[PDB]
Amino acid sequence: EEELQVIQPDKSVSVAAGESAILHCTVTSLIPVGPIQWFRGAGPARELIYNQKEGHFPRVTTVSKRENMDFSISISNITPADAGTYYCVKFRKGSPDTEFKSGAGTELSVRAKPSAPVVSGPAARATPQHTVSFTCESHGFSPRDITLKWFKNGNELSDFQTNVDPVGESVSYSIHSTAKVVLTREDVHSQVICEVAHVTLQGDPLRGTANLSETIRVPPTLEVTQQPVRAENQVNVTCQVRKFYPQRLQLTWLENGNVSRTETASTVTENKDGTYNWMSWLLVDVKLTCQVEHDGQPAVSKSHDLK
Ligand SMILES: *[C@@H]1O[C@H](CO)[C@@H](O)[C@H](O)[C@H]1NC(C)=O
């Protein structure tokens, strides 16, 4: 009978997060007498995973009598934090029991899905033809390999920068990406999309969206005119506030620098591009000024004179 050998037939095992991992180990001899123990890591600070003779290991279960020679284990509910190299080790009986021979080790790698991509646009709004940044973020996947793409309404974008961290080794990875997007006057109904592809994903990439309606500001055009009034000594003066977004607009009517009336747009019409239209009118050497404050921005105004 040849001397006891500890045999770990698998150099590496790959498990999906949440599943059970099987770590195989068989010993060739029953002598010398002593327990088999499982560890993660070797040398300094190795972690006891299972002890055949005593203790509680709820996650550990035996995969196989006194002539038992198979010491394979199963570990339930795997997480990325279980990744590492596992060693099956034979000890000689004693108090305490001394180490005798170690298996060659089995590397356990764990597969985790990326989290749903979160897309954030800038803090303040911008007008058409401005460039704005969007950030995309996804965490906790392994392996490190991943693919990130950006789209604006279906067209893939190219102007972006991506980072995966750690650059070094870890159990889970994160991805962070920033894309530069040029706003047009048609973006109220537009959407920016960040999609990630990973092996743990059954064909369909995870997507994160951001609606440009939250980011765009389209300033109103003003137009002040005068209408025929039946009664004499009266003129209908109108201000048309057209094609604006969002719908937050305050309008003050002025008479030679004197506040005649203030108003908030309440019932607007909508255009095909998602912007709104509104109009205010009042019955009146004299100047009339239609003064507008759109979405908390600096007042703009058109002035008009009396017949
Ligand atoms: C002033 O003109 C507007 C725009 O045509 C109209 O809707 C409004 O009713 C007019 N005011 C009066 C008193 O007719």
From Swiss-Prot:
The gene is SIRPA. One of its GO terms (molecular function) is GTPase regulator activity. Ubiquitous. Highly expressed in brain. Detected on myeloid cells, but not T-cells. Detected at lower levels in heart, placenta, lung, testis, ovary, colon, liver, small intestine, prostate, spleen, kidney, skeletal muscle and pancreas. Residues 114-213, 220-307 form the Ig-like C1-type domain. This is Tyrosine-protein phosphatase non-receptor type substrate 1. The chain holds residues 31 to 348 of 504 of the full protein. It comes from Homo sapiens. Disulfide bonds join 25-88, 136-194, 239-290. Binds PTPN11 when tyrosine-phosphorylated, except in macrophages, where it primarily binds PTPN6. Binds GRB2 in vitro. Binds FGR. Binds JAK2 irrespective of its phosphorylation status and forms a stable complex. Binds SCAP1 and/or SCAP2. The resulting complex recruits FYB1. Binds PTK2B. Interacts with TRIM2. It is a single-pass type I membrane protein. GO terms for biological process: cell adhesion; cell migration; cellular response to hydrogen peroxide; cellular response to interleukin-1; cellular response to interleukin-12; cellular response to type II interferon; monocyte extravasation; negative regulation of canonical NF-kappaB signal transduction.
